[PDB]
Design a protein around this ligand. Structure first.
Ligand code: B12
Ligand code: B12
Ligand code: B12
Ligand code: B12
Ligand SMILES: C[C@H]1O[C@@H](n2cnc3c(N)ncnc32)[C@H](O)[C@@H]1O
Ligand SMILES: C[C@H]1O[C@@H](n2cnc3c(N)ncnc32)[C@H](O)[C@@H]1O
Ligand SMILES: C[C@H]1O[C@@H](n2cnc3c(N)ncnc32)[C@H](O)[C@@H]1O
Ligand SMILES: C[C@H]1O[C@@H](n2cnc3c(N)ncnc32)[C@H](O)[C@@H]1O
Lengths: 192, 194, 194, 193
């Protein structure tokens, strides 16, 4: 399915790509299709670009497509009432699908995760959390560099709980920034 | 808007692929709740009226119903299922119309309530035992027909769970009161009351 | 074996856990394997446990409703090819539908357009739909024997150009009396029709 | 006003309410109409409110992300017809993507297979994908002027046999310098093809 989907995308067959994604969804289930189809295809797109096998426009097409599929699943999940959890990425972080995954996992567990989009200045994020009485903020870091650019303690009081995760993040950097480090998306809902 | 006619027609000619495409269009246009209200419900109602007029047979209704039930079940599984005390959702003994109960479960889950849809037609002692064993916060019943409610003794629903809700075309305030359930008119009011 | 874990998760209302275990079975054993080694044994065990007084009706309902939804997913994934449809249902008075769903699944897996109607379809209505859609066959699942016994000699004979009957409620003798082709194995079905 | 209601629902993080109001607009105005009467005015007002210091970036982000999801839904509902595709994106350094999405939507609604790439595509990569898909045209949305100004003379030439440039950041003179056809109106796009 992963191969088929990427091949369909690279020949501009959006309809066929959508059918293959839906097949993955029916077999693996919602979480499973993300783990077994969406994530491996995105990773492979990145590796192929890095090896010079595809260009940026091919990656863009695939990413935009898979982002739309995840957004579909996100809107089909519950959005419960009550204090929201704000989900975004650090300033300078333009990879948004990890944040979307975090929001999706939370919503699937009945947590009102408000996905903001990526790349939110910290004072503005803090102000929104405060004004909505958000119980937590969740950040996805794909790159390490946006975290490195932040001063010590910069995440510390965005909200009563601040969670940081993603391939760009680690325990030490979380500690330096004053966030709780989370390894697994499934641990997020537990923590809340 | 022509989607309802198109969907029914596709179903009646056994074009499941076409019917699925039309349902998906409705979903994209109206949203999850909207497609149920503006496509699924009107088509089922019209199927019932056509049958009652003698215009279609039972097999046609069955085909349509089975299809729409599967679409709603898809939406149900895509909604959140949170942890915590469940709400048990079913229909009264003798009530075999299940789509209203499925709708109730769907609306609850979309609002973050862990609605366990049991299927239809659950004996009251067995329902009570499951509620007790799972420590359910509530039971919700959909009554499409009035007759299964009329067959129940006064107060029969009273303490199935700490909260008991009754709704559907078969139910009214008076009958709810006689049976000891809280009457709900709107599916949207269900999540609120909880 | 995931069957115990799955049933246990279901009985405590852990839908997420139940779904994870079913998906694990799917990934390890595949669609056909999970039906034979997980779905069918759990349904059988649910029946035996009810019969022995160990679980109530609401527990069975929850498990059945869950597995029915999973099978409906597999049914839609097996796809609906073009061509004359095969109508799949159960006899009048037969409300156990999962056997019919299995038959539709096995047919679709072999490229046959099996239209699942849902259960419990009156024979004249079934015959009329088969005729109007130009169905090449009708397939019936009988779980109980009583609905078959209630039918007159030859009642299944001419529902469609080919009529197939199977399930635990059916046997060769009763199939012959009713004028249907008796089938034991679901995998033999597509070959018999071919 | 649905526009006021929708913005207010978004600003207080009421996604359910926001979705209901958007759906009402969609049912009343239809797909085209909801874009013109609801989606576009709200985005414009979000921009003005930010610029006046009335809302922060996180509020704009929430509104934009919501409307982008709704437009992506409309895009997929308009369908993706067969045939040589038209690639739709924004210039390198242009991160405003909703104009490009609109262009793709209008084209698809007229039966043109507009493949929306996402924003911010380097031109050699865009050229390669157009070539590989045998795309008949490329369409670019420029919201800012600066990403166009950074490009060399003729940089948009021959991305495909037809290259269209539009948006608030674009003008006839800059289109000419870059070797694109300038387009003012989204509805004129399908006509031009
Ligand atoms: C798509 C993509 C882009 C797109 C993103 C589009 C979008 N709107 O989202 C665009 C074009 C913007 C892009 C740009 C760039 N990217 Co890029 N791209 C990717 C790609 C192909 C996929 C991204 C993705 O969605 N992955 C899915 C991710 C999130 O999954 P994951 O990290 O495995 O996440 C898991 C866990 O971390 C967990 N998780 C994630 N978030 C969180 C949060 C919490 C709280 C928790 C508990 C868990 C959790 O969830 C996942 C489940 O397993 C990756 C390839 C890859 N990821 O390996 C790169 C990649 C990240 N990009 C890379 C690069 C180099 C770039 C650019 C610098 C390129 C450039 N010169 O322009 C820019 C940087 C832009 C920026 N400042 O952010 C590199 C980074 C390598 C590195 N760190 O050294 C990668 C790895 C590609 C590669 N092989 O070289 N990219
Ligand atoms: C499909 C169908 C069947 C199917 C059901 C299949 C299944 N597995 O669900 C089957 C074949 C089993 C069936 C059988 C029969 N049914 Co029938 N059938 C229908 C049909 C076409 C659609 C049912 C449906 O799903 N509708 C969608 C429902 C849920 O919408 P709704 O009821 O309007 O619900 C809305 C609200 O009431 C609310 N709601 C619902 N439940 C709840 C619960 C709460 C708490 C809340 C707040 C709200 C709420 O939400 C919905 C959206 O707004 C209807 C036609 C119709 N107009 O309803 C009949 C209909 C209900 N059936 C009818 C009849 C007569 C029968 C049979 C007696 C026929 C027969 N002799 O065999 C049997 C009875 C079986 C039994 N119950 O014991 C009649 C009932 C007439 C009456 N009471 O006056 C109807 C109305 C058809 C007609 N026009 O005559 N039926
Ligand atoms: C779920 C269930 C129900 C559900 C069904 C829900 C639904 N929407 O489908 C409900 C709650 C409605 C129900 C009700 C009742 N049921 Co019940 N229940 C079951 C249960 C637990 C599973 C049903 C199922 O899906 N079975 C799985 C089937 C598909 O597997 P299988 O029978 O082994 O079939 C194999 C082959 O036959 C083949 N196959 C099946 N069909 C076909 C068709 C063809 C063409 C081919 C080639 C092959 C084939 O596939 C399988 C393996 O390869 C069974 C237990 C069981 N079956 O062992 C009972 C069971 C069938 N029910 C039983 C009873 C007693 C009842 C009721 C009378 C209970 C009552 N109310 O008093 C009612 C009758 C309803 C009616 N039909 O009129 C009993 C007894 C049947 C009997 N003859 O003795 C059973 C066996 C449980 C028990 N141990 O007592 N039931
Ligand atoms: C949402 C938004 C963002 C988001 C975008 C998210 C996303 N993924 O798309 C983010 C946060 C990324 C953002 C960032 C910035 N943006 Co901004 N933001 C906006 C906002 C509020 C809406 C954008 C939008 O979708 N507009 C809808 C567009 C399509 O509306 P439109 O103008 O009516 O477009 C019409 C026509 O041009 C036509 N059209 C559009 N494209 C095309 C193409 C063709 C071929 C055709 C025929 C027609 C056509 O169709 C539309 C309807 O008729 C606008 C407000 C605005 N007035 O546009 C700004 C705005 C564009 N942003 C602005 C600024 C300053 C920024 C930043 C520099 C801020 C900063 N300091 O970081 C950055 C720059 C990032 C970059 N490199 O691109 C300013 C630009 C002012 C200027 N040009 O000097 C605006 C106007 C806000 C303001 N009032 O000050 N922004
Ligand atoms: C990590 C992803 O970033 C994309 N990428 C690499 N360079 C650029 C650029 N200049 N502009 C936009 N996207 C880029 C590639 O397609 C890669 O797959
Ligand atoms: C309410 C629905 O009940 C169905 N219906 C009517 N009579 C029967 C029967 N004998 N068996 C099964 N379903 C029946 C019809 O299809 C109608 O539309
Ligand atoms: C075959 C299955 O039928 C279910 N069953 C038994 N009696 C009833 C009833 N009155 N109503 C609904 N389901 C019932 C049991 O759960 C058993 O497991
Ligand atoms: C044009 C839009 O850009 C957003 N915006 C302004 N500055 C930044 C920044 N540093 N990072 C991210 N988004 C920003 C604002 O929210 C404005 O509404």
């Amino acid at each position: 399915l992963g191969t088929g989907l990427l091949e369909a995308l690279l020949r501009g067959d959006l309809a066929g790509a959508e059918a293959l994604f839906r097949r993955g969804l029916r077999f693996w289930g919602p979480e499973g299709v993300l783990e077994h189809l969406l994530l491996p295809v995105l990773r492979e797109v990145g590796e192929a670009w890095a090896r010079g096998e595809i260009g940026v426009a091919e990656e863009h097409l695939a990413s935009t497509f898979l982002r739309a599929r995840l957004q579909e699943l996100l809107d089909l999940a519950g959005f419960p009432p009550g204090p929201p959890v704000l989900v975004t990425t650090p300033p300078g972080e333009r990879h948004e699908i990890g944040a979307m995954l975090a929001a999706y996992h939370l919503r699937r567990k009945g947590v009102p995760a408000l996905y903001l989009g990526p790349d939110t200045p910290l004072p503005d994020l803090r102000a929104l959390a405060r004004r909505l009485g958000a119980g937590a903020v969740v950040l996805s870091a794909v790159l390490s560099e946006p975290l490195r650019a932040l001063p010590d303690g910069a995440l510390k009081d965005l909200a009563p709980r601040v969670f940081l995760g993603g391939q760009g993040a680690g325990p030490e950097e979380a500690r330096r920034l004053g966030a709780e480090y989370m390894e697994d998306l499934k641990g997020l809902a537990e923590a809340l």
